């Protein structure tokens, strides 16, 4: 039922980012939570790396875009500074 799970947005493998695969397997009888599982720790580290990469790429492209905007403003101001420092004479 991978296509149906994809249609509902619940991955395709039922072992992918579900509560069934991400909730803790067990806990102590009196109620203390278990230490985190190795696979869940690895998945959280990978997701943190993924999110940091998303942030880095987004802000890098944004910074490049505003840098290009600033270069265009400098080009247009150097184009618009077109005052003749001396006044024409002669046949005028």
């Amino acid at each position: 039922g991978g296509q149906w799970r994809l249609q509902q947005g619940l991955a395709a493998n039922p072992s992918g980012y579900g509560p069934l695969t991400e909730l803790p397997d067990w806990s102590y009888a009196d109620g203390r939570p278990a230490p985190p599982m190795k696979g869940q720790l690895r998945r959280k580290a990978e997701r943190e790396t993924f999110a940091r990469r998303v942030v880095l790429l987004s802000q890098e492209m944004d910074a490049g875009l505003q840098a290009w905007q600033l270069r265009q403003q400098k080009l247009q101001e150097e184009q618009r500074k077109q005052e003749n420092a001396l006044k024409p004479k002669g046949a005028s």
Partner: protein
């Protein structure tokens, strides 16, 4: 009674193979995935003059890190401690 001359899938005379419905459906599925890839590649965000220099600092510092490692390759230290702990193989009780 019916022999394909030589090897079945090579040569002038080959054993014929015919296209099945599920093979056709598999190819149609991959074709749809690629048409969608064509669309999402057909819309770009920036242009070349806008992207001309937006990651040069990061690429340069990554290569400087690679250079730093390749230059820092060098033999490790040696220890009086390690040699005198090899002395311990004859440590008897009494």
């Amino acid at each position: 009674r019916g022999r394909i001359p030589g090897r079945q899938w090579i040569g002038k005379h080959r054993r014929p193979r015919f296209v099945s419905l599920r093979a056709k459906q598999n190819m149609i599925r991959r074709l749809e995935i690629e048409a969608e890839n064509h669309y999402w590649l057909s819309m770009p965000y920036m242009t070349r003059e806008q992207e001309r220099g937006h990651a040069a600092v990061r690429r340069r510092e990554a290569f400087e890190a690679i250079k730093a490692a390749a230059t820092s390759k060098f033999p490790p230290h040696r220890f009086i401690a390690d040699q005198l702990d090899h002395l311990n193989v004859t440590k008897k009780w009494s």
